Design a protein around this ligand. Structure first.
Ligand code: CLA
Ligand code: CLA
Ligand code: CLA
Ligand code: CLA
Ligand code: CLA
Ligand code: CLA
Ligand code: CLA
Ligand code: XAT
Ligand code: XAT
Ligand code: XAT
Ligand code: BCR
Lengths: 194, 74, 41, 164, 215, 74, 193
């Protein structure tokens, strides 16, 4: 278990207590059937993985000073010459679009319809952490926690840029500058009247 | 009488659509078209009476003869 | 007058009351709405 | 102008025919005293006539070379060009009342079949049953499609034939 | 049983135990439209959805209408919000209606198939694990699952209370929209403008001072 | 007849023959303006027969003094 | 089975579960009889193969820059000089017309009236994929799905060019350009209002 998400409320019967990241949070009974819970326990981890990579990419561009996450796919219109660490990339839109359509499918289709695995031991642990003896569930819990926080962070990125038109650091600095005039309410979007 | 071609006894009793479309289709007509003269006379009169209306409709709009459709009474 | 109301419910009496009703409905309509050739608004 | 036609508010044969009818009514009116009972009815005929021409020109009816309004009886040439009130709106305003009467009479027959002798209530119509089926038949297409989905609209081959 | 007319014979197909245990049954069917039980089962769905869409629409008319006449919004009239907001729009109306009919038809055909056979969308392998919460409840018209996030159905007491509150607010909103259309046709003003016109002179400004109650 | 008797010819039901005027305009009668196949100068059935059989046929339909596809009304 | 095409509906009884490409989709009861259904299964696969070849020919011309699928048989009127990979073809219309009339019937009529076969093992599998051991129906199902998608793509080509006068990529670039103004409603054809 390790958590109750709303104290005093009961835990549902269809959530196993040994499952990593468990709190009992299913107010829709959305994973009630075990096949759907088995599909969603695989897909939450993968959303968390790709969102941790997404928040690291969206923050490292601004911490390294190369624009933001929003304007990084803005060279395909109104010019070109994409960069990475300052190194130029001589690729147009259609070539890298086809390479992302092909070279990712050769790993996605190799992952997905070859089973239902979500923690594959072996080559994906080069250093060696998950020998599944004692520290399996603890590292899985930390991965789930950090990934859920990253999904919340990326949805905050999307809403923050849709409301203010700025980057993550570019308005975290404003919230640190004017803490009472640079929040989600002083814009005329998220709070409709006041 | 020469081996090649098509036969009236085989084309009729094979054009039958299944699943209750036309029932048994055209099975058994050659026993009744060939043996009946009133059936043959009825089909012949239907064809002649339609292509006679066709002659009438197409000889006024498309007059085939020289100086027809100036002779209005004709 | 139950027999009189069964007489009033016979076929020609209902026919001549209902046809005067559906006649004098359409007639009052064509008085208050003259000449409806087309469905206007 | 859909099929060689013209709007009646545009054509001049329509206005000439209006002036023709008003001319006949005027030369008919010239015989009477201006406040007498025939002259009031003749001027009322003129007013109904002019209102009829104004409301036929207002609805966008199409005149021909004859100066007479025409009816475009095709949806897609009436819906596209704004002539749906010619045929396409009264072709459902009729069919509601047609299926209405055809449903009321149907239900009056079916609700009188299961009695002692039905024929006496066909020459002597049961008026409270008739008016009950007259009022409650207002939603006939609804009940007709709900009856068609059963198969209780049709009857099977229990029907009476001769020699197939 | 708290009928719409206290002295009427209620139609007998609205006094069955299938129909008396139905939401908002006040014995009102003077034209016999639900005499077949599956016709009534279909029209109960039609009433729920005609009333929920009307509650959403009438809220979207008179909540910004009352928040326009009291300031701090500038939402126009409901019969003017199609003329405007197509300029402040990424798309014209035709493409928007096409996307609308695709996204809404995908919903409405699943609802069609669930009405014609209950628990249809809950059969496994339909969606990608999402179909398990799509059986609805034991009765049709009230699905729950993803459509009850706050969880007001897990009570089994005061549930007919919530049903009847939904049905009565919905019937009132359907009458309100038929209102909005008619009080637009009659005098050409807005609904809150018509409410202000009635409240400033009730005994002279009403539907007896226009051409629609004509003798 | 009742409208002609009461002196009101405008109240007649004069349904225009739309379905056959469309066939005349698809055959090349440019009097109605449906411009569908042969009365439209830009279509393919018009264009792929200008040397083959069309111009005499188009000059014969649009003559209003033969019986070749008479103009039609209510 | 592998699919229900409208979930919760009952499957029609005249469709076997072992048949490749199955969903139960027959809302007209159109393949109810088995002799008709066998010929429909034999014809759906061949419509799928010829439409996969048709969509590959319609797309590779625009992806390699040689006009479209529409204007490629437009040298028969107003000129000539057919191309293929840029290589010129010194043939007129009637010669290749008769060659398609003769040389294709020696494959079509040899295929068709010599039985009813639709998956023939042997010379048509040079590398070896369908040994009918374990992965017969899987590859058959993939062939059915890709072929049905290609048939829908070719009918989309037909309606797209009949509505906009443009090619596949020539309007896919526009739908990627103006995604709310370059769809099937902004033309005055598909949606009449
Ligand atoms: C062509 C390459 C390719 C292929 C074949 C696959 C194939 C697959 N991916 Mg994958 N993926 C790819 C590229 C590809 N992906 C790329 C490039 C990324 C990075 C962006 C990902 C990221 C990714 C994640 C994160 C996950 C997968 C998953 C899956 C599997 C589920 C199949 C499915 O449902 O389809 C998906 C088909 C769609 C049409 C996707 C619909 C659009 C999604 C929902 C995004 C929309 C977000 C939206 C805001 C939310 C909905 C609205 C909401 C606000 C109400 C499948 C094996 C999932 C999995 O394994 O499940 C267990 C999973 O968790 N992939
Ligand atoms: C099938 C052939 C046919 C057709 C299509 C028409 C069509 C028409 N005729 Mg014509 N006519 C015909 C044969 C036909 N006629 C014949 C054979 C004759 C010689 C007898 C005439 C003699 C004739 C005359 C003398 C006149 C017409 C008129 C008309 C027009 C109808 C206007 C009208 O009354 O609106 C009726 C409109 C309605 C909407 C009526 C519907 C009834 C109500 C509103 C619906 C029900 C409401 C409510 C539920 C009822 C309450 C129920 C109660 C129990 C409480 C219309 C163009 C009139 C006209 O204007 O000419 C153009 C006119 O003056 N016709
Ligand atoms: C789309 C990503 C995704 C997916 C598939 C899941 C899936 C799951 N979560 Mg999870 N979660 C997520 C994102 C996601 N989560 C995020 C972002 C947070 C942080 C806010 C959490 C926080 C969280 C907690 C605290 C717990 C879970 C739990 C669960 C499990 C059971 C609940 C269930 O059936 O969810 C199925 C979920 C979906 C099908 C996603 C539907 C998304 C809808 C359509 C839109 C949501 C809109 C959103 C509010 C705003 C955008 C299941 C494995 C429970 C568990 O045991 O953990 C394993 C638990 O206690 N989640
Ligand atoms: C007797 C059958 C018939 C015939 C010959 C036509 C004839 C025609 N229709 Mg039409 N149509 C019909 C029935 C018919 N329609 C029916 C029953 C409907 C559905 C209610 C339509 C809906 C319709 C539309 C929506 C359109 C046509 C159009 C056309 C024209 C091409 C031509 C005049 C088109 C047009 O305006 O001409 C270009 C057009 O857009 N029709
Ligand atoms: C349901 C419904 C109803 C009752 C109305 C009613 C109305 N719409 Mg409307 N509309 C609807 C759905 C509906 N609309 C939808 C689904 C769309 C999206 C395509 C629109 C887009 C739309 C536009 C773009 C316009 C209207 C306009 C109008 C008004 C003129 C008649 C009228 C009040 C017009 C308006 O308000 O101008 C005065 C107008 O210009 N509507
Ligand atoms: C013309 C090619 C063709 C043919 C011969 C078939 C034949 C068949 N299909 Mg199929 N199908 C096709 C194209 C075709 N399909 C396309 C393009 C799609 C994608 C939209 C599908 C999607 C599909 C599904 C999802 C399923 C089938 C199924 C079937 C089988 C039973 C249904 C039936 O009787 O259909 C007979 C159909 C015809 C003889 C075609 C007649 C076409 C009519 C006359 C006009 C249609 C016009 C169209 C709607 C618009 C253009 C049968 C073997 C079922 C099955 O088990 O698969 C084997 C099934 O579940 N089909
Ligand atoms: C010459 C010729 C002859 C004799 C046939 C004869 C036949 N074809 Mg065929 N065909 C031909 C040219 C010909 N075709 C060409 C040039 C094409 C490409 C456009 C096709 C595409 C084609 C398809 C796609 C199909 C046939 C089918 C059939 C059979 C019905 C029959 C054996 C059908 C068949 O065998 O299924 C019943 C079928 O599905 N043929
Ligand atoms: C928020 C989220 C999911 C939210 C779902 C929630 C809360 C659902 C909760 C519930 O279901 C449960 C749990 C239980 C139910 O009973 C109730 C509810 C409440 C319904 C997923 C985000 C998931 C977000 C993900 C996966 C984001 C990945 C981001 C990536 C890959 C970004 C890449 C880039 O940023 C870089 C790297 C560089 C840039 O230049 C380019 C781009 C491309 C922009
Ligand atoms: C659904 C509905 C309205 C929904 C409105 C919507 C979505 C509005 C949306 C918009 O406004 C916004 C948001 C913003 C605007 O800018 C745009 C639009 C688009 C305009 C009204 C239903 C309105 C439905 C009504 C009024 C139905 C009335 C039916 C009655 C009274 C029938 C009674 C009987 O049938 C019984 C019960 C029994 C029989 O025996 C007897 C009789 C009498 C026959
Ligand atoms: C779409 C299609 C069939 C669609 C039928 C459907 C959906 C029927 C569905 C139903 O019946 C079922 C299933 C069940 C029933 O109960 C109900 C319905 C709903 C009725 C066939 C296309 C079939 C399409 C085919 C075979 C297309 C082949 C294309 C070719 C060969 C193209 C060649 C070229 O493009 C090149 C290569 C080069 C260019 O330069 C020259 C040309 C010539 C243009
Ligand atoms: C749009 C339109 C049109 C067209 C039309 C059409 C084309 C139609 C078709 C139609 C059809 C194609 C039909 C069919 C049918 C079939 C059937 C089969 C039917 C049946 C019916 C019935 C059966 C009924 C019954 C009933 C009811 C329900 C009510 C009353 C009573 C009774 C019982 C009688 C026109 C232009 C002309 C005009 C305008 C409109």
């Amino acid at each position: 278990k390790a958590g109750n998400w709303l104290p005093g409320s009961d835990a549902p019967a269809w959530l196993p207590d040994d499952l990593p990241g468990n709190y009992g949070f299913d107010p829709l009974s959305l994973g009630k059937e075990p096949a759907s819970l088995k599909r969603f326990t695989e897909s939450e981890v993968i959303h968390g993985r790709w969102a941790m990579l997404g928040v690291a990419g969206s923050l490292a561009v601004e911490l390294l000073g190369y624009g933001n996450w929003y304007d990084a796919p803005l060279w395909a219109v109104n010019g070109g010459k994409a960069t990475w660490f300052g190194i130029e990339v001589p690729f147009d839109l259609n070539a890298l679009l086809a390479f992302e359509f092909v070279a990712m499918a050769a790993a996605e289709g190799q992952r997905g319809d070859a089973g239902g695995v979500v923690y594959p031991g072996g080559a994906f642990d080069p250093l060696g952490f998950a020998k599944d003896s004692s520290k399996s569930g603890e590292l899985k819990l930390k991965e789930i926690k950090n990934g859920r926080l990253a999904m919340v962070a990326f949805l905050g990125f999307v809403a923050q840029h849709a409301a203010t038109g700025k980057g993550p650091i570019a308005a975290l600095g404003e919230h640190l500058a004017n803490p009472w005039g640079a929040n989600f309410a002083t814009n005329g979007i998220s709070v409709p009247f006041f | 009488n020469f081996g090649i071609g098509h036969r009236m006894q085989a084309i009729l009793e094979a054009h039958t659509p299944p699943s209750g479309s036309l029932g048994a289709g055209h099975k058994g007509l050659f026993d009744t078209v060939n043996n009946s003269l009133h059936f043959q006379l009825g089909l012949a009169l239907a064809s002649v009476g339609t292509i006679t209306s066709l002659v009438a409709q197409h000889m006024y709009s498309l007059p085939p003869y020289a100086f027809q459709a100036i002779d209005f009474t004709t | 007058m139950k027999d009189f109301t069964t007489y009033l419910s016979t076929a020609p009496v209902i026919a001549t009351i209902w046809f005067t009703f559906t006649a004098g409905l359409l007639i009052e309509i064509n008085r208050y709405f003259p000449d409806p050739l087309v469905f206007s608004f | 102008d859909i099929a060689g036609l013209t709007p009646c508010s545009e054509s001049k044969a329509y206005a000439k025919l209006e002036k023709k009818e008003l001319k006949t009514l005027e030369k008919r009116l010239k015989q009477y005293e201006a406040d007498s009972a025939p002259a009031v009815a003749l001027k009322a005929t003129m007013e109904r006539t002019k209102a009829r021409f104004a409301n036929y020109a207002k609805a966008g009816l199409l005149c021909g070379n004859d100066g007479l309004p025409h009816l475009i009886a095709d949806p897609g040439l009436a819906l596209k060009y704004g002539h749906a009130g010619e045929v396409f709106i009264p072709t459902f305003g009729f069919l509601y009342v047609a299926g209405y009467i055809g449903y009321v009479g149907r239900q009056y027959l079916i609700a009188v079949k299961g009695e002692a002798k039905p024929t006496d209530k066909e020459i002597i119509i049961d008026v409270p049953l008739a008016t009950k089926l007259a009022w409650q038949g207002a939603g006939w297409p609804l009940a007709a499609v709900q009856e068609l989905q059963r198969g209780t609209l049709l009857e099977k081959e229990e029907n009476i034939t001769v020699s197939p | 049983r708290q009928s719409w007319l206290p002295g009427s014979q209620i139609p007998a197909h609205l006094d069955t135990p299938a129909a008396q245990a139905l939401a908002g049954n006040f014995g009102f069917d003077p034209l016999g439209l639900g005499k077949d039980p599956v016709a009534l089962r279909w029209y109960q769905q039609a009433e729920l959805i005609h009333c929920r869409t009307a509650m959403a629409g009438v809220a979207g008319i008179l909540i910004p209408g009352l928040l326009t006449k009291a300031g701090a919004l500038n939402v126009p009239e409901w019969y003017d919000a199609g003329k405007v907001a197509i300029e402040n729009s990424f798309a014209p109306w035709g493409s928007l209606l096409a996307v609308q009919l695709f996204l809404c038809g995908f919903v409405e055909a699943k609802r069609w198939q669930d009405i014609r056979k209950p628990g249809s969308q809950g059969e496994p392998g339909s969606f990608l694990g999402f179909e398990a919460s799509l059986k609805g409840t034991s009765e049709l018209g009230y699905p729950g699952g993803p459509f009850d996030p706050l969880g007001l159905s897990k009570e089994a007491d005061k549930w007919a209370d919530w049903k009847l509150k939904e049905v009565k607010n919905g019937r009132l909103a359907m009458l309100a929209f038929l209102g909005f259309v008619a009080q637009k046709y009659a005098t050409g003003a807005g609904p809150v403008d018509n409410l202000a016109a009635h409240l400033k002179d009730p005994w002279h400004v009403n539907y007896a001072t226009n051409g629609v109650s004509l003798p | 007849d009742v409208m002609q008797a009461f002196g009101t010819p405008e109240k007649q039901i004069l349904i225009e023959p739309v379905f056959a005027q469309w066939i005349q305009a698809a055959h090349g009668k440019a009097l109605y303006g449906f411009d569908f196949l042969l009365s439209s100068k830009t279509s393919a059935a018009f264009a792929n027969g200008q040397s083959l059989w069309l111009p005499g046929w188009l000059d014969a339909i649009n003559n209003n003094q033969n019986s070749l596809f008479l103009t039609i009304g209510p």
